[PDB]
């Protein structure tokens, strides 16, 4: 299967209640392995997966140092963004940043990414070539001018094609039992009357990993996508994921309806039936 390493950063200003709250997390695929919280007592980058705990003191020290440097850089960003947008001191605002890399089945580099948002909206993103910038409004054009003059793309590119992939492979190796696994969904459908003339059909997928899955309802082979309630894929808390899709059907037409489950752990996609 293909793999990814991504780091996620959130900084939130807090007018007159001290400094911005900064939270960082790192993931390999859908498995979190580090956190930093600016409000916690430890002030340390902390392990959140068992296979990261073996990393020695240099690692923890280096990641604590770098994570703090990411935090200070976001504190500055919040100030700068309030000036670009002519915003007052009176309101809380949010900067988010995400970066990392994807590798293919052969663990070779596929793609790199480095994206910022302000107040929930795209701000600036490194393009696919790792040489250029997409800036989403006029303020972010000011950032693009500054980042081009300072050759920011080049330094990001060297990390994303090089270091990022090297550490992803190392984590994949060390955490092989956890990370190089696929757990196929355990599927079923439930049936419950909502009146004497309608029933809720709900198609379930349980205990699966990774999180990526497609659940779809058909009526006589036709997709029921506008009539389907699809919940967001959710963690079970044990390292696996769950999802369901439901339709409300007239009683008596159950046999017309089929659920269709697609997941990388399934040898073939499954069709579940009421007959």
């Amino acid at each position: 299967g293909s793999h990814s390493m991504r780091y996620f950063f959130t900084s939130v200003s807090r007018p007159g209640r001290g400094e911005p709250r900064f939270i960082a997390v790192g993931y390999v695929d859908d498995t979190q392995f580090v956190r930093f919280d600016s409000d916690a007592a430890s002030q340390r980058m902390e392990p959140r997966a068992p296979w990261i705990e073996q990393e020695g003191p240099e690692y923890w020290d280096g990641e604590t140092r770098k994570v703090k440097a990411h935090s200070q850089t976001h504190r500055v960003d919040l100030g700068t963004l309030r000036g670009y947008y002519n915003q007052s001191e009176a309101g809380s605002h949010t900067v988010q940043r995400m970066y990392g890399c994807d590798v293919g089945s052969d663990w070779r580099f596929l793609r790199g990414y480095h994206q910022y948002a302000y107040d929930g909206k795209d701000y600036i993103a490194l393009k696919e070539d790792l040489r250029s910038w997409t800036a989403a409004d006029m303020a972010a054009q000011t950032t693009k001018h500054k980042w081009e003059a300072a050759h920011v793309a080049e330094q990001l590119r060297a990390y994303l094609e090089g270091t990022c992939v090297e550490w992803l492979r190392r984590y994949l190796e060390n955490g092989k039992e956890t990370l190089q696994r696929t757990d196929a969904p355990k599927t079923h459908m439930t049936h419950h009357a909502v009146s004497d003339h309608e029933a809720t059909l709900r198609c379930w997928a349980l205990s699966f990993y990774p999180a990526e899955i497609t659940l779809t309802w058909q009526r006589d082979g036709e997709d029921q996508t506008q009539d389907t309630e699809l919940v967001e894929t959710r963690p079970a808390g044990d390292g696996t994921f769950q999802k369901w899709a439901a339709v409300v059907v007239p009683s008596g037409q159950e046999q017309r309806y089929t659920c269709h489950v697609q997941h990388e752990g399934l040898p073939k996609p499954l069709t579940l039936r009421w007959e």
Partner: peptide, 6 residues
């Protein structure tokens, strides 16, 4: 492992 102001 981890790796600029706007």
């Amino acid at each position: 492992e981890l790796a600029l102001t706007v």
